[PDB]
Design a binder for these strands. Sequence first.
DNA 1: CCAGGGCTGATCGTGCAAAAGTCGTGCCAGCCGTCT
Lengths: 49, 403
Amino acid sequence: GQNMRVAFMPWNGYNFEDSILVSERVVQEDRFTTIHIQELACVSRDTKL
Amino acid sequence: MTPQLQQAIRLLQLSTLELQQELQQALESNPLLEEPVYQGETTQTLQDYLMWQVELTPFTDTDRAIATSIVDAVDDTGYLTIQIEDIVDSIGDDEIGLEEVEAVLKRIQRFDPVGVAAKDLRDCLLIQLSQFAKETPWLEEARLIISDHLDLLANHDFRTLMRVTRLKEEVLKEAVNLIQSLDPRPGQSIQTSEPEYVIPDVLVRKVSGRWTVELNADSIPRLKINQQYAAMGNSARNDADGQFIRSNLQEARWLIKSLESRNDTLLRVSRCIVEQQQAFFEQGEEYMKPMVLADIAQAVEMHESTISRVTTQKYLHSPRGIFELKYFFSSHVNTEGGGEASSTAIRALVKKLIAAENPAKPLSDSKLTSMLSEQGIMVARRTVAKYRESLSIPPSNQRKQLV
DNA sequence: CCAGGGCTGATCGTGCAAAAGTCGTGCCAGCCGTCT
């Protein structure tokens, strides 16, 4: 994973029970960005006609 | 020259489908002879989809009823089948005229696939131009050549068309493009397939550039004499019983043996016709010698009929393609170049040469005959003409258009 | 009791000539691009 600066404190009930509040500076800094190389494929299935 | 054998050797000249079927046919007669996922997802496609739209729109009972009649006569390929008047007669009315049905049949002309259920080409295309923006440069031109003067357009000629219909060579040609970029047969827009069609038989061995007598996968009809019923033969009660059991046993043994005999014959029989022909595969579809059954029985160790019967209805299969054994039969064609040729090879060459030509200036018969003579084939001009017109290849002088 | 002759169930041969389909190939008719 990655190192992140944390602070155990309630914040307007956004971390109410087990939700993790995340600053906008984490999306801006391209942190926790993952790539996903999915790949489909089409066959030929030659018929008799 | 035998009954109990005359067929026992004509019972293989058919496909394995029927063989299995007749083998079952006679598998009941002889007691002693023997051998979730219900989630089928449904779909639509311009029948249900067409009907789907019908409900949404505001059509009255008499109109809705009529709608289905015409929406159900819409052939999947493209347009409707029967004529319009047909439809009036299949309502079963006298007060209802064509006008009443016209609307209902006119309203549908503008549904999912614009042009669906058109009938007689012209109406389809014409409608498609209606929903187009009227601020289109070639709007009036296209429409003018859509209502009339279509025959000429259909022909290879176009100069006579423009001179009569008050059209120029520059602008009018571009109007053509708007009629050309208009997709007739809109009914197949929401159409699709999902088929298969494939049969196995003798496969390939693939050994150092050679495929052969290989093996038999699943074509042997499990014919093992029953042993629980056979134990009662010798210890039969009456004469009736004993006779019965012995007759059925002898015939079973006969059939066992005839089935085994038929297997082997065709088993190693798939290696001499195909070898006598090692040019159509390796070299390609062009490069083909003439072969005859009479000549095949001469090469192999057997009679002509014997081999003709085995080869019939026996689809072969190599990683190079699957063709029926009987289809390999070809006539003759003098060449004078160390071996004769076939008309299928004429046809394939005509076709590969019409493919690689100038599109504007078409290739021809005497030209094709000359090209052939250049490569060293020496054929008639007729054979070429015939092989060209057999493949539904249009005339090349009529295949010309505006480059 | 054993070998010779007659009876009979087993076991073969998967062949062969006859009538029709097929294209090499020549003949013949219709049609269009061009120069007269």
